[PDB]
Design a protein around this ligand. Structure first.
Ligand SMILES: [Cl-]
Ligand SMILES: [Mn+2]
Ligand SMILES: [Mn+2]
Lengths: 563, 569
């Protein structure tokens, strides 16, 4: 056990040992790339999943074998015979929480603030997009009000999800053997705009849905809750969009994959007894390995992204890389408070009374608790070792860490640092706070609702398989079943979500090995106590909330992105 | 990294470093036990499965999800509706090779010499067991001959599989909910005796084959409740074969597979870690053949011999009974370790290469496991001798190797494996004794485990050929047998599904390959020895390919390209 220390404070012998360890780690953690995504060349055996991990994962897969044995779903590309069949896919699995109430407009809307992807909704200011021609008459008919759109917008009552980021997807293709002939079909993509309003007990309510980006009163009209089944179908497409942005942007890109350069830089530039390495590595546990499983089984040819998502694998990969690049180029701007403020849903986005324009936002409140607790944690921890900015500046290993991260072949994190150089303790506190928050809380918030909201296929199908029907046509059960995924791909989606949610590989603030520094043990203990308080506070709030939001309870938050 | 060296040949500083490494290894490889079975306390991360291994295993399990999705089998304890339903369990999996011909008496018999458990059959000497009252009239009726039992025995024509090792099994219990009430049922135990005869004339072709003569389903004879069945008994003979196959499968998994490959290897891995320096030549020789062994044995503890695991669900006895059988097999093996070397093990069953008639030909000429396994044993023996002779020239080096002597003492000790049959005179004193030991360990880890592990899918994933348990009593010899009778004897749908699941996972890929370690020997002489071993393995592969061109059916499980480097699945 070696006391952590800054390299400039070590002896020449100690410094040479640090440099030898760094050389060996650079040999073991080499940089590689898959379709432009930075990954590791060869996973070190020390970075593999543990035996315990493998036992839990295997338990999940075997449970899926049993559940499939007890299920009546078939290995065919036909639709389900009945919509009710979707509720019979879980004979030996937990029932997804959204299953009973997914048709409800409020349950649809609340997934924007407490579902798997609570990262899209933004407050409308000035006007709606010109390609989203919602009219005063529509708004007044829906809200049963005399208020106009401009008055609602001026009051901060209107919110929007604009899935334009999917407009350029090449639709995915699928094929299968039927009666000795190969059948080839194409998925139907959509990039909807969804208008919500805060209705003051107060609830977020869906107002309008335009399924595609370019308006037309006949072929791409604005649907409202007054359009019955058509409205229902509209929501499906909206949900599909929210799913594709969830997996490509919010889950894979902006947790799993943007963490890879930080793990690799930590190995490539920080000695084992560097305080920042000691701080961060518990929050990298199994991250490289789970990202190798993402390479092998998710974003590979024939994998889950190919099978399930709306676009071709190439299109999905394009979306992922764009999300990564925007995150890295503006790293500091994706800190939780700034990210919330940029969408107009931060804690400072209040009306004249001081009340938030979006008062019900469980992800925001709980994630803010976790963010501030983490910030105090890394500030005190780093204060144990950095007292003057000169120690930051003269830490050659830390400087090489930054330089590796912003370099084009080390992650290209051009938004990581100001003035081209890391110079202050507080900037490092922000960096480490954001890394730890992403690895634990954020990944928990986007990963673990996947089963409750996405293993029940009709609530959030990862692709749609037929075009939106004409606004005047009659909608039968067969129409909806033809839009929803066929049996085999619904099975594959349940398979995926169950594997991604089966267990918690670790726990936030509880590393496998204690800190060597007793002072660091104290700071970590304080972090654990604060997590206890946060757990109690969230339990209280969940007593108050319309529905409990459990995904950011500290006991449900892993220490690292690891599943 | 370091050139391999004996510890007494090192400087005091180098010896200090060896002792430090051994101390840390002792801290990381601690001894533990589950139900009296020696295992590791906590697996070091360096001993975990690799990422590639996990990817392959996950491919297996997901493929099982897909095959289950495409199948019509249900999650119920009801029997199948039709026997043909057992042929429908593989819509997205390879068809087990035995499936189409499992009813044939010669296919049943040849699994004694080329199936998953080619380890039970022995040549009958002097007489049959007194509790197995086969008569001259039965033998003459089935063989269509005037020859007597005594004459056939004197000619070495008769062989037997006696499953008395299962006679004390407590039958396993199972239960389930049907119409809102709990149904509790018990499996049926059998410990059969099976009499075979070698037919040189065969079927009129210039070939020979074992043929089944008689089956007594249980050990204590009775003309009414435990009679001797023969091929003349129609459906009753088919059922008798089902019970004999169930017994052979239980002995296979408990004795031949789990006990005498996986579990007897654990003390050698642990002793290598606990007593041998990283640069010790014996450790460098043995560790490639231990890759993933501790890990897969932790999976065996967790998912096989655990409560609710595969052994609890599928095997004939209770989990406690199966564990008793496993531990008895382990103890006999360790007590007579040298006597379980392949040539000696074959000789003790009267089916060794020296078991020949007056014409020089073997009493059991058709024994693919023996032929190919002998090739691999001899090749490994040459490899081990030539490797060890690079480091041990005179026996004094053996005796003065403190680490090797500690390795032996650890192995023979009650807490380190109880391998009381490992050495003579209480001490390892000669080079050739270490050659025999290392040869046997490598043979077990690679070839033997291959021979008992990889036929599991071809012969045991088709349930009716070898069900791991039977679920009804053998019908009375005079009773009429319907399809529902046989379906009630065969496993219910859920447990048949579980058996397919298991066999598929156990046979889905090769974690490594015999003679191809992940990292080369630093000693160029040792690497040359290894290269010669690889060329010998290619020669053996071609020889086996020719033999298979001449055999009744190919025997592929001991092709060196199909033999892993370690027991690892
Ligand atoms: Cl023992
Ligand atoms: Mn994840
Ligand atoms: Mn095995």
């Amino acid at each position: 056990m070696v006391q952590p220390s800054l390299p400039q404070d070590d002896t020449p012998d100690q410094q040479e040992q640090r440099n030898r360890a760094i050389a060996q780690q650079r040999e073991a953690y080499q940089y590689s790339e898959t379709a432009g995504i930075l990954l590791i060349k060869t996973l070190p055996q020390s970075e593999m999943f543990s035996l315990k991990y493998l036992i839990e994962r295997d338990k999940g897969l075997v449970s899926l074998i049993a559940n499939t044995l007890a299920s009546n779903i078939e290995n065919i590309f036909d639709p389900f015979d009945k919509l009710e069949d979707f509720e019979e896919m879980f004979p030996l699995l937990p029932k997804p929480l959204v299953m009973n109430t997914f048709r409800n407009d409020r349950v649809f809307a609340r997934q924007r603030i407490a579902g798997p992807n609570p990262m899209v909704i933004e407050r409308v200011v000035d006007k709606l997009p010109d390609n989203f021609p919602v009219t005063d008459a529509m708004f007044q008919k829906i809200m049963f009000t005399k208020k106009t759109l401009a008055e609602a917008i001026a009051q901060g009552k209107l919110f929007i999800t604009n899935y334009k980021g999917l407009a350029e997807l090449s639709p995915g293709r699928y094929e299968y053997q039927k009666n000795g002939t190969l059948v080839q079909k194409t998925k139907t993509i959509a990039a909807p705009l969804v208008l919500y309003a805060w209705k003051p007990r107060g609830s977020l309510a869906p107002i309008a849905i335009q399924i595609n980006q370019q308006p037309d009163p006949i072929t791409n009209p604005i649907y409202t809750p007054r359009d019955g089944k058509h409205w229902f179908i509209a929501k499906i497409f909206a949900q599909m969009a929210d799913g594709n942005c969830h997996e490509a942007i919010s889950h894979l890109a902006r947790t799993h994959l943007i963490l890879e350069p930080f793990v690799l830089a930590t190995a490539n530039e920080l000695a084992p007894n560097h305080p920042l390495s000691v701080l961060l590595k518990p929050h990298f546990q199994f991250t490289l390995a789970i990202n190798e499983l993402a390479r092998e089984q998710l974003i590979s040819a024939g994998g889950y992204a190919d099978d399930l998502l709306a676009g071709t694998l190439e299109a999905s990969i394009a979306v992922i890389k764009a999300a990564i690049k925007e995150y890295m180029d503006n790293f500091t701007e994706f800190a939780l408070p700034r990210e919330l403020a940029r969408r107009g849903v931060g804690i400072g986005d209040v009306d004249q009374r001081g009340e938030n324009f979006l008062p019900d936002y469980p992800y925001r409140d709980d994630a803010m608790l976790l963010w501030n607790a983490i910030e105090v944690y890394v500030r005190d921890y780093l204060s144990l070792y950095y007292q003057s900015p000169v120690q930051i500046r003269q830490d050659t290993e830390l400087q090489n860490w930054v330089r590796r991260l912003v370099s084009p072949e080390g992650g290209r994190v051009t938004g990581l640092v100001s003035n081209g150089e890391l110079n202050t303790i507080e900037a490092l506190v922000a960096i480490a706070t954001q890394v730890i928050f992403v690895s634990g809380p954020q990944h928990a918030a986007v990963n673990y609702p996947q089963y409750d909201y996405m293993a029940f296929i009709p609530n959030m199908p990862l692709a749609t398989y037929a075009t939106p029907p004409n606004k005047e046509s009659n909608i039968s059960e067969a129409t909806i079943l033809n839009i929803l995924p066929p049996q085999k791909l619904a099975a594959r989606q349940l398979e995926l979500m169950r594997t991604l949610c089966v267990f918690y590989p670790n726990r936030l603030g509880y590393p496998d090995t204690e800190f060597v520094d007793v002072r660091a043990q104290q700071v970590l203990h304080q972090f654990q106590e604060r997590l206890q308080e946060i757990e109690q506070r969230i339990v209280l709030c969940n007593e108050k909330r319309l529905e409990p939001y459990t995904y950011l309870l500290p006991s449900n938050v892993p220490n690292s992105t690891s599943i």
